[PDB]
Every structure is written in C-alpha cells, then in structure tokens.
Amino acid sequence: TKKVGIVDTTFARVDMASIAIKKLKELSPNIKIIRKTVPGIKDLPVACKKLLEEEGCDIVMALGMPGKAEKDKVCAHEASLGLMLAQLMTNKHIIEVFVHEDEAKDDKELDWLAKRRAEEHAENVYYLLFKPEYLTRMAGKGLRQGFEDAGP
Amino acid sequence: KKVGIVDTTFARVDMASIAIKKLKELSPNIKIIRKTVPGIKDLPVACKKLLEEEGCDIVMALGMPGKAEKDKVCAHEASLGLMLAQLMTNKHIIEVFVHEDEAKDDKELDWLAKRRAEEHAENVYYLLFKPEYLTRMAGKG
Amino acid sequence: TKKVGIVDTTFARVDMASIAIKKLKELSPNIKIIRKTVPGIKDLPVACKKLLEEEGCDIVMALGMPGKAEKDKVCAHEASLGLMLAQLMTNKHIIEVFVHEDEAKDDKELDWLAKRRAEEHAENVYYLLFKPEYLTRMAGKGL
Amino acid sequence: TKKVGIVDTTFARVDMASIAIKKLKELSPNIKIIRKTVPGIKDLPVACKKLLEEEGCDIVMALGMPGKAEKDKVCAHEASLGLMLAQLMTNKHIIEVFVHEDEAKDDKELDWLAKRRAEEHAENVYYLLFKPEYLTRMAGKGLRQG
Amino acid sequence: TKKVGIVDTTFARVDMASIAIKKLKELSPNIKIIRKTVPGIKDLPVACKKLLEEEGCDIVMALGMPGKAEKDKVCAHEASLGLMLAQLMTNKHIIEVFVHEDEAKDDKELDWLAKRRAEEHAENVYYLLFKPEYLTRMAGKGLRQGFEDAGP
Numbered sequence: 001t002k003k004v005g006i007v008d009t010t011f012a013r014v015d016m017a018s019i020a021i022k023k024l025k026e027l028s029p030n031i032k033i034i035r036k037t038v039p040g041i042k043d044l045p046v047a048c049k050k051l052l053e054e055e056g057c058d059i060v061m062a063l064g065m066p067g068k069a070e071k072d073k074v075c076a077h078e079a080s081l082g083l084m085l086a087q088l089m090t091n092k093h094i095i096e097v098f099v100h101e102d103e104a105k106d107d108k109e110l111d112w113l114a115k116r117r118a119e120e121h122a123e124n125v126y127y128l129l130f131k132p133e134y135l136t137r138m139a140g141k142g143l144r145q146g147f148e149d150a151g152p
Numbered sequence: 153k154k155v156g157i158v159d160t161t162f163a164r165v166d167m168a169s170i171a172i173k174k175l176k177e178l179s180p181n182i183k184i185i186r187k188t189v190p191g192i193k194d195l196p197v198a199c200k201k202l203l204e205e206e207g208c209d210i211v212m213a214l215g216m217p218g219k220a221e222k223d224k225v226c227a228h229e230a231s232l233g234l235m236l237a238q239l240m241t242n243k244h245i246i247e248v249f250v251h252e253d254e255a256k257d258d259k260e261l262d263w264l265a266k267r268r269a270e271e272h273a274e275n276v277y278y279l280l281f282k283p284e285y286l287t288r289m290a291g292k293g
Numbered sequence: 294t295k296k297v298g299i300v301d302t303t304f305a306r307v308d309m310a311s312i313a314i315k316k317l318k319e320l321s322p323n324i325k326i327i328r329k330t331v332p333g334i335k336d337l338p339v340a341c342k343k344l345l346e347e348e349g350c351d352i353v354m355a356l357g358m359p360g361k362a363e364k365d366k367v368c369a370h371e372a373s374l375g376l377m378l379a380q381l382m383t384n385k386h387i388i389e390v391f392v393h394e395d396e397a398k399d400d401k402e403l404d405w406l407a408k409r410r411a412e413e414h415a416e417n418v419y420y421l422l423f424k425p426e427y428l429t430r431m432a433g434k435g436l
Numbered sequence: 437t438k439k440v441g442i443v444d445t446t447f448a449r450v451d452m453a454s455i456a457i458k459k460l461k462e463l464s465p466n467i468k469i470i471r472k473t474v475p476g477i478k479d480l481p482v483a484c485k486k487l488l489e490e491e492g493c494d495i496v497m498a499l500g501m502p503g504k505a506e507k508d509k510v511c512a513h514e515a516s517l518g519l520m521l522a523q524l525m526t527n528k529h530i531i532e533v534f535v536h537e538d539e540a541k542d543d544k545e546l547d548w549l550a551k552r553r554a555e556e557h558a559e560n561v562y563y564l565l566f567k568p569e570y571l572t573r574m575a576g577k578g579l580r581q582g
Numbered sequence: 583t584k585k586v587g588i589v590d591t592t593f594a595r596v597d598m599a600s601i602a603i604k605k606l607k608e609l610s611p612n613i614k615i616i617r618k619t620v621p622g623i624k625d626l627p628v629a630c631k632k633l634l635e636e637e638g639c640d641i642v643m644a645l646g647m648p649g650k651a652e653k654d655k656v657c658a659h660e661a662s663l664g665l666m667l668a669q670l671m672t673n674k675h676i677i678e679v680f681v682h683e684d685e686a687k688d689d690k691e692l693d694w695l696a697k698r699r700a701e702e703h704a705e706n707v708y709y710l711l712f713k714p715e716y717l718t719r720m721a722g723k724g725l726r727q728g729f730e731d732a733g734p
C-alpha cells in the first residue's frame with residue numbers, strides 16, 4: 001500500500017498525471033509513485049500490468065483520452081477491456097481515468113474536466129489503499145469524478 | 153458459508169443493505185463481508201479478490217449504470233469482467249445491475265433496485281443451500 | 294461411461310431441459326445426466342464450467358432464453374462469450390441452446406420452437422459423443 | 437511431415453472442406469490431414485483447440501458460414517473471438533474461413549465464392565507451413581481477391 | 583541487444599514494414615530485427631505472440647489495413663483484441679499500426695498516410711526501448727502518428 005503506478009499517454013491532449021500525483025503526495029507525503037508514458041490508449045494495459053507485477057505497485061492509475069471519432073470509441077472500449085483483464089490477472093486494482101473530448105464544450109473545459117476527474121480518482125486510490133471503510137460509508141451515494149456528484 | 157457483497161459509490165441507490173438483511177434473514181449465521189469500490193468497472197477484481205483471498209463461496213456485485221449511451225459500454229465491460237472472474241475461480245458472482253433507464257423516477261428507481269437486490273439475495277441463498285428449488289422453477293412461466 | 298451435464302435457468306419461460314434429457318436417454322439409455330439450474334443467462338458459464346471440471350461431465354448443454362429488449366441481446370452476447378471461454382479453458386464442448394422470444398410469433402410457437410431446438414441439439418450432443426463421423430457426413434448441409 | 441486440422445460445420449450451406457483438403461494434398465501430397473465436423477460456428481473454437489493440442493495439428497483451418505440475420509453476425513463475431521483465443525492459448529495459427537451469405541447474390545455464386553475462398557486460404561496454410569518467405573514477398577500487395 | 587519483431591500482412595494494400603524497419607535501423611544501427619508476414623489482420627495476434635515468446639523479441643510492431651466494408655471494422659476490432667491479449671500474456675508491448683482505407687481520400691494519400699504512421703510508431707518503439715523518459719516529457723502533448731499532431 002506504499003506504492004502507486006501512474007500510466008499516461010502522449011496521445012492525450014491534457015496532462016492528467018501531474019494533478020493526480022500531487023493529490024496522492026498530499027494525502028500520503030511518503031507514498032511511492034512511479035510513472036510510465038506510452039503512445040496511447042491501447043498501450044496502457046500491458047504497461048499497467050508490468051507496473052503491478054514487475055515494479056511492485058500495489059495499485060495503478062491509467063490516464064487516457066479517446067479522440068472524438070467513433071473508431072476512437074472502439075479503441076477506448078478495447079483499451080478498457082485490456083485494463084479489466086490486467087486487473088483480474090494480478091488481483092490488483094487499476095483505476096481507469098478516461099476523458100472523452102466529447103464531454104467538454106471547449107479546450108478550457110476539457111482541460112478542467114480531465115484534471116478534476118484525475119484528481120478525484122486520485123482520492124479514490126488513496127481511500128482504496130488506506131481507508132477502504134470510507135468508500136463503504138459512501139456506498140450508494142451517487143458520487144462522480146469530474147462533474148458534480150449526482151447524489152442518491 | 154460466506155457471501156461477499158461488493159457495491160459502489162457511483163450507484164445512486166444503496167442496494168447492499170437490503171441484500172444483506174435478506175441473507176441474514178434466510179440464514180441468521182451466514183458470514184457476510186462487504187467492499188465498496190468507486191464504480192462499475194472496479195467491481196470485477198474486487199469480486200475476484202473476495203472469492204480467492206477472503207474465502208467467499210459466492211459474491212453479489214451491485215452496480216448502477218448511468219443514463220448515457222457510453223455508460224452502457226462501461227456496464228458491458230464490467231459485466232464481461234464479472235463473467236471472467238467467475239470462470240477463473242469456478243465460483244458464482246450474482247450480478248445485480250440496475251440501469252436508471254428502467255425507472256420513470258427516483259422513487260421507482262430506488263424501489264426497483266432494492267427489490268432486485270433483495271430478490272437476487274434469495275437466489276444466492278438457493279444456490280448455497282437449496283439448489284434443488286431453482287430446478288423446480290426451471291423455465292417457469 | 295459418458296456423462297452429459299445440462300444447465301438451464303429460472304428466467305427462461307420454457308422448460309427445454311426435459312425434452313433434451315428425454316432425447317439423450319432415448320439415443321443412449323446408458324447415458325449419465327446431471328442437471329443444475331441457475332437464475333439466468335449470465336449464470337450459465339461458471340455452472341457449465343464447474344460441471345465439466347468438478348462433476349466429470351464429458352460435455353454440457355446450456356439452455357437459455359434471452360428476452361426481447363436490446364439489453365437482453367447484450368446479456369445474451371456476454372453469456373455466449375462466457376460459454377466460449379469455458380470451453381476453451383476445459384477443452385470440452387458446451388452446446389449452446391438459446392432461444393430468443395423474438396423468434397416466435399407467440400407463446401405457443403415459442404414453446405414449440407425452444408423444445409424442438411433443445412431436442413435437436415440433444416441429438417448433436419449424442420453424435421459428438423458416439424458418432425462424430427455422422428456429423429462429417431452432413432458437413433456443409435445441403436441448402 | 438506437418439499435420440493440418442480441418443474443422444467445418446453441419447450448419448454451413450456449402451462444403452468448403454473438400455476443396456481445401458484437395459488443395460493441400462496437391463501442394464503437399466505428404467501433409468497429414470484430420471477432419472472434425474461440429475454443429476455450427478460457435479462450436480469451432482474448442483474443436484480447433486482440441487485438434488491443435490490433442491491431435492498434434494501444427495495448424496488448423498476453421499470453415500464456417502454465418503447466416504444473414506444480424507443475430508448471425510453476432511454469433512460469427514463471438515465465434516471469431518473464440519478462434520483468436522484458441523490460437524493465443526496454443527501459439528498455433530487457425531486460418532479462419534468464414535463466408536457470409538450476404539456476400540453472394542445467390543447460391544450459385546455463394547457456392548463458388550466459399551469454395552474459392554477456402555481453396556485460396558488452403559494455399560495460405562501451405563505457405564505458412566513450408567514457404568513463410570513467399571508471404572513476405574507479397575507483403576502489402578493487397579492480396580484478397582483483387 | 584534488443585530485438586524488434588515486425589509482423590505485416592499480404593492483405594494490406596500498402597507496404598508499411600519497409601518504412602518502419604528503415605526508421606529503426608536509422609535510430610539504432612545495431613538493432614536486431616525479424617519479420618513475419620501472415621495473410622491478414624486476424625492472423626497477426628498469434629504471429630506477434632510467437633515472436634515475443636519464441637524468437638526473443640523485446641517488442642513487436644503489428645502492421646495491418648482493415649478494408650472498407652464495415653464487416654472489416656469488426657475483423658479489425660477482433661484483431662486488436664487479440665493484440666491486447668497477446669501483450670497481457672507476455673508482458674511485452676505490441677505497437678499496433680492499423681490504417682483504415684476510410685482515412686485517405688485516395689491511394690496516393692493512403693500510401694502516404696500508412697507509411698508516415700508506420701514510421702512515426704517506429705520512433706515510439708525506439709523511445710520505448712531506449713528513451714522511455716522522452717515519452718514522459720511529451721505526456722499530454724496530444725501527439726499523433728499519421729496526420730499532424732493535435733497538440734494539448
């Protein structure tokens with residue numbers, strides 16, 4: 001529970017890793033973090049798996065941004081399937097942080113949205129690592145990452 | 153016997169409480185363990201860890217897909233993970249998903265989700281102690 | 294000698310297992326059969342796998358009925374994927390017997406259709422177990 | 437010396453196996469062949485895997501005919517996924533030979549098309565087994581049917 | 583030291599392998615490389631896996647071209663899933679280089695686009711093998727392989 005892996009891409013149009021890392025060190029100052037950047041979405045799964053199995057990461061955050069196009073939705077889906085499988089093969093959680101450009105109305109909002117979502121899931125990593133009990137307290141409360149919570 | 157119950161913070165309805173209460177009702181002594189994850193896609197590995205690392209004989213996965221057309225994709229990916237976790241452990245994972253699209257309002261959504269959770273809680277029971285009952289109800293309707 | 298596992302559901306609106314079992318015992322009275330009923334479609338894969346690996350079944354029949362919704366089509370697809378994987382992980386066949394309600398024009402026909410399909414695949418199980426040569430003779434059907 | 441497994445179905449409306457087998461024995465009268473017929477598309481994966489792992493096949497050909505209904509497209513897709521997995525689990529190639537009825541304008545053409553495709557992939561099996569170098573020579577030359 | 587596997591197809595209407603190979607040897611003269619050609623898209627996964635596990639490749643490039651038909655889109659998707667799985671099963675990266683004909687307006691452009699994308703991913707292979715740090719420096723920059731980068 002002392003090590004987190006953060007995998008992002010060169011394809012993404014927003015730097016989500018910096019915000020995540022800063023949030024984790026904030027909650028746990030001495031936590032160990034390792035980063036790895038790959039070209040894009042479909043390169044994340046094996047990078048996340050290698051970190052979990054070869055670098056001793058207890059958990060990993062996968063940061064990606066599918067483009068607007070339809071086929072990008074397919075690539076995302078394929079990438080997400082890879083993430084699901086990597087987790088089942090290692091029995092370790094991979095927090096998926098994907099932000100579709102279709103969600104923002106502009107680049108200012110897209111940048112805001114991605115960083116906010118990254119940071120919020122960074123708290124989820126924290127809770128999963130040290131306060132699993134908190135999440136249960138919030139069970140069924142309709143929490144969201146990025147835009148405002150929806151609530152019960 | 154032990155049942156694992158995994159739910160989420162994303163869900164807008166608490167389905168776990170109703171399930172747990174139903175199980176303890178049918179079997180007062182059954183041991184139950186809970187684990188809450190952020191959302192739908194985080195359920196598979198949590199269910200698997202419970203089956204393999206906490207001795208759960210069976211697990212209930214509680215989730216609530218969003219309304220968007222993409223949440224349908226996330227749900228589908230999550231369900232695939234649940235299918236695989238089961239095949240990899242040879243243990244059942246009762247999937248309890250409730251799409252918001254099914255209810256006409258939050259009052260109905262809350263009712264529907266809890267009712268479905270509780271009913272599948274009975275299925276867990278039957279699978280654990282009375283597998284014969286389910287056969288009696290085979291293809292019934 | 295040979296054992297067949299039959300897995301059905303409580304969700305299905307038609308009893309397809311009885312017809313299948315009767316057909317198998319007919320073609321092979323010395324056939325051993327073990328049944329297991331689960332709630333629905335998505336619960337079939339692991340039940341089929343447990344039968345193949347934990348109960349010594351040489352082959353298994355999976356009986357299910359997806360509903361009409363386009364969702365149900367997704368659940369069916371996910372269930373079928375599970376069946377495909379269970380087979381590859383055990384190197385044993387799982388004869389999938391799914392009947393969508395959309396295929397029948399009403400209940401009478403649905404009941405007929407499901408039972409007829411179950412029974413016909415029951416023959417396929419038979420052939421796969423004792424007369425694999427027959428199937429080859431029928432390779433590529435004839436229209 | 438090498439062994440090739442051929443798996444087809446009773447669902448298919450065209451016999452694609454005969455043409456393939458004849459083509460292989462033609463190019464390699466010494467290749468070893470072993471056939472297995474299953475009910476349909478979704479029964480091919482495990483049959484192909486059993487041949488690769490239990491019968492010593494070096495490679496396998498999967499012959500199937502998806503139907504016209506979109507439901508048939510889903511089954512095909514699921515079947516193809518099984519074929520992909522069987523290969524990754526054995527580290528052996530499975531040449532997928534599927535022919536959708538939607539491709540022909542009639543049976544006359546459907547029968548021709550299926551047999552032609554089966555036979556052409558039968559050459560691919562040959563090349564993969566004995567002349568892997570040939571395929572490289574044809575890398576990116578748009579081999580399909582045009 | 584360091585071996586790159588390159589797998590392409592006879593189905594593809596453009597030779598993407600030559601450009602990739604030339605780019606790698608350019609960036610790493612002593613880089614070792616082997617090639618394997620299969621019929622098409624769906625034959626790539628096991629070929630890539632055999633190279634990673636049986637020929638000692640540290641990484642592999644998969645070059646393919648889905649055809650026009652939407653049927654092709656399904657085959658592509660199935661092929662990509664195979665690539666994702668091969669990677670998770672070997673803990674080695676497989677750089678997917680697919681080029682849909684739908685992306686070009688003509689063959690002149692299709693040929694240009696495929697070669698340019700192949701070459702650019704050839705640099706990604708390079709970076710992944712020797713300068714993983716570079717990719718991190720470009721994290722979130724919105725880089726593309728093929729058409730111009732999008733940028734953050």
Ligand SMILES: O=c1[nH]c(=O)c2[nH]c(=O)c(=O)n(C[C@H](O)[C@H](O)[C@H](O)CO)c2[nH]1
Nearest residue numbers: 011039040041042066067072075677678
């Ligand atoms: O991060 C990505 N987002 C996308 O929307 C997208 N779309 C595509 O069509 C696409 O090919 N990619 C690239 C992909 O993730 C891989 O980096 C590439 O296949 C090399 O392995 C990406 N990558």
Ligand SMILES: O=c1[nH]c(=O)c2[nH]c(=O)c(=O)n(C[C@H](O)[C@H](O)[C@H](O)CO)c2[nH]1
Nearest residue numbers: 096097098099144145146218220222223
């Ligand atoms: O709360 C969210 N957390 C996420 O990690 C996440 N990831 C995604 O890829 C994503 O698209 N979303 C948004 C969600 O799908 C919906 O669009 C949103 O809830 C509005 O209906 C979310 N929403």
Ligand SMILES: O=c1[nH]c(=O)c2[nH]c(=O)c(=O)n(C[C@H](O)[C@H](O)[C@H](O)CO)c2[nH]1
Nearest residue numbers: 095096162190191192193217218223226
């Ligand atoms: O429970 C969820 N239901 C959804 O419909 C949904 N949709 C999304 O697009 C989405 O990203 N999520 C995220 C999920 O809650 C987790 O936070 C995510 O799997 C881990 O990063 C969820 N989560």
Ligand SMILES: O=c1[nH]c(=O)c2[nH]c(=O)c(=O)n(C[C@H](O)[C@H](O)[C@H](O)CO)c2[nH]1
Nearest residue numbers: 247248249250251268360361362364365
């Ligand atoms: O009876 C049901 N049990 C469930 O677990 C379940 N889960 C779901 O996600 C779900 O959508 N349904 C209902 C489904 O939409 C259909 O109405 C049903 O299959 C046919 O009546 C059901 N229906």
Ligand SMILES: O=c1[nH]c(=O)c2[nH]c(=O)c(=O)n(C[C@H](O)[C@H](O)[C@H](O)CO)c2[nH]1
Nearest residue numbers: 246247304332333334335358359360365
């Ligand atoms: O047999 C089923 N047929 C269906 O059409 C259908 N549709 C649904 O939306 C659905 O949730 N189910 C149930 C599902 O198969 C599982 O039994 C349920 O999720 C419990 O794990 C079924 N089950």
Ligand SMILES: O=c1[nH]c(=O)c2[nH]c(=O)c(=O)n(C[C@H](O)[C@H](O)[C@H](O)CO)c2[nH]1
Nearest residue numbers: 389390391392393396410503505507508
């Ligand atoms: O003729 C069939 N035999 C079967 O065993 C079988 N099994 C199935 O699971 C199944 O869905 N079908 C349906 C069939 O393929 C067609 O989609 C249906 O007839 C609609 O035209 C059939 N159809």
Ligand SMILES: O=c1[nH]c(=O)c2[nH]c(=O)c(=O)n(C[C@H](O)[C@H](O)[C@H](O)CO)c2[nH]1
Nearest residue numbers: 389447475476477478501502503508511
């Ligand atoms: O070869 C097939 N082509 C199809 O289009 C098709 N469609 C269907 O709905 C269908 O059920 N099948 C049969 C399937 O391949 C299996 O044989 C069946 O599920 C059990 O044996 C087939 N089989």
Ligand SMILES: O=c1[nH]c(=O)c2[nH]c(=O)c(=O)n(C[C@H](O)[C@H](O)[C@H](O)CO)c2[nH]1
Nearest residue numbers: 534535536579580581649650651653654
């Ligand atoms: O050349 C082909 N070889 C095949 O093995 C094959 N298999 C198929 O299932 C199939 O549908 N096709 C044809 C396909 O529809 C396209 O015409 C072809 O990919 C050219 O774009 C082909 N086309």
Ligand SMILES: O=c1[nH]c(=O)c2[nH]c(=O)c(=O)n(C[C@H](O)[C@H](O)[C@H](O)CO)c2[nH]1
Nearest residue numbers: 531532593621622623624648649654657
């Ligand atoms: O490279 C390919 N691109 C395509 O668009 C395409 N479409 C098809 O319908 C198709 O069957 N193929 C061939 C496929 O990739 C395999 O080579 C073939 O199944 C032999 O195993 C391909 N192959």
Ligand SMILES: O=c1[nH]c(=O)c2[nH]c(=O)c(=O)n(C[C@H](O)[C@H](O)[C@H](O)CO)c2[nH]1
Nearest residue numbers: 067068069071072680681725726727728
């Ligand atoms: O930049 C890209 N690198 C790739 O490797 C790649 N591969 C593909 O198969 C592919 O379709 N693309 C294009 C992609 O679909 C998008 O159009 C592009 O990312 C624009 O956002 C890309 N785009």
